[PDB]
Structures are given as C-alpha cells and as structure tokens.
Amino acid sequence: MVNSFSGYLKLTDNVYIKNADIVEEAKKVKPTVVVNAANVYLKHGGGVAGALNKATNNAMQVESDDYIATNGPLKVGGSCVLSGHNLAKHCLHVVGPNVNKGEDIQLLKSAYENFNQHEVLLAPLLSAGIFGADPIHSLRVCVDTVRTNVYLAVFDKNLYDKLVSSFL
Numbered sequence: 001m002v003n004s005f006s007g008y009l010k011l012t013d014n015v016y017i018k019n020a021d022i023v024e025e026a027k028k029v030k031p032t033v034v035v036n037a038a039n040v041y042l043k044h045g046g047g048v049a050g051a052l053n054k055a056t057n058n059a060m061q062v063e064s065d066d067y068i069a070t071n072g073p074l075k076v077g078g079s080c081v082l083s084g085h086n087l088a089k090h091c092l093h094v095v096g097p098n099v100n101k102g103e104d105i106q107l108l109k110s111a112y113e114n115f116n117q118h119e120v121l122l123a124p125l126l127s128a129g130i131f132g133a134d135p136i137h138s139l140r141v142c143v144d145t146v147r148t149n150v151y152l153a154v155f156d157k158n159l160y161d162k163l164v165s166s167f168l
C-alpha cells in the first residue's frame with residue numbers, strides 16, 4: 001500500500017518519526033491501522049487514547065465498552081483490533097506496562113510485538129506518557145522489536161527534538 005504519510009524523518013529501514021498529533025495524522029492519512037496506547041480496561045481517558053476517542057465523538061469508547069463486556073480486559077503487553085471509525089480502517093489498541101504502578105518494563109517489548117501483525121501502522125510511543133516509561137527507552141524498544149513499517153507521531157516538540165538526536 002502507498003499512503004500519504006509526509007514529512008517523516010527516517011530512523012531505520014522500517015521506522016519513521018514526526019513531530020505531530022496522531023489524531024491529525026490519522027485524519028489526514030486515514031491509515032489502515034492507527035495504534036492506541038491503551039490500558040487493559042480500554043478506558044480512553046487521556047493522552048493518545050483520550051484524544052483519539054474524542055475525535056471519534058466517543059464511538060471508540062462505546063465500541064470498547066462492548067468489547068470488554070464480551071471479552072474482559074486485555075493483558076498487559078496485549079492488544080485487540082477494533083474499528084478506526086472516522087480516523088483509520090482499524091485501531092490496534094495496545095497495552096504497554098504501567099511502570100508507575102509497578103508493572104514490568106520488560107512487557108513493553110511484548111506490547112510492540114503486536115505491531116508485527118500489521119504491515120503498516122501509525123503509532124505513538126507506548127508507555128512513554130502517563131505510564132512512566134523513559135521515552136527514549138520506548139523508542140529503542142520499538143526500533144529493536146517492530147519489523148513492519150511504523151510511522152511514529154510524537155506530539156511533544158521538546159521530546160521529539162531530544163529523541164531524534166539520541167542514539168538508538
């Protein structure tokens with residue numbers, strides 16, 4: 001597939017990065033897969049999840065509530081594929097570890113492995129926000145784990161500028 005992703009810096013053969021709001025990227029590109037940085041309950045309160053959900057006029061949350069009622073919570077490091085609504089064909093909800101609540105940072109690798117089930121993804125840095133993982137570590141795990149084509153949208157300008165001048 002050829003998508004309209006534009007303005008990305010190349011990190012590796014398969015990883016690209018941009019200082020952009022993932023919601024705006026998704027609206028513009030309408031990718032096959034947008035990744036959400038979820039919790040196990042799919043309660044999309046803030047950060048990427050809250051912003052994606054608001055942009056769907058709460059349809060993502062309503063769908064997620066049905067998913068949980070049927071299937072129960074995700075695993076830490078796990079994922080599910082749901083609709084992307086008005087933003088993308090699909091949303092891959094992926095749960096990084098909540099390091100701030102004692103969950104094992106090693107599960108971040110398991111979380112990123114879910115990306116390998118999709119040829120192309122628009123994604124955030126899992127666990128790097130409210131979940132408290134070091135952002136550069138999340139980027140390095142992404143680079144070292146994901147083999148499919150991943151376009152990373154980093155909202156925060158100061159963070160982006162630091163990440164792109166760090167070794168991988």
Ligand SMILES: Nc1ncnc2c1ncn2[C@@H]1O[C@H](COP(=O)(O)OP(=O)(O)OC[C@H]2O[C@H](O)[C@H](O)[C@@H]2O)[C@@H](O)[C@H]1O
Nearest residue numbers: 021022037039044045046047048049127128129130131155
């Ligand atoms: N609109 C955005 N576009 C791109 N990146 C963003 C955006 N908003 C935040 N980031 C960055 O995206 C990165 C991830 O920040 P987070 O979204 O907190 O995800 P987590 O995995 O740490 O925490 C999961 C919880 O977050 C939610 O509350 C969920 O419901 C979960 O409970 C950071 O670098 C952010 O600067």
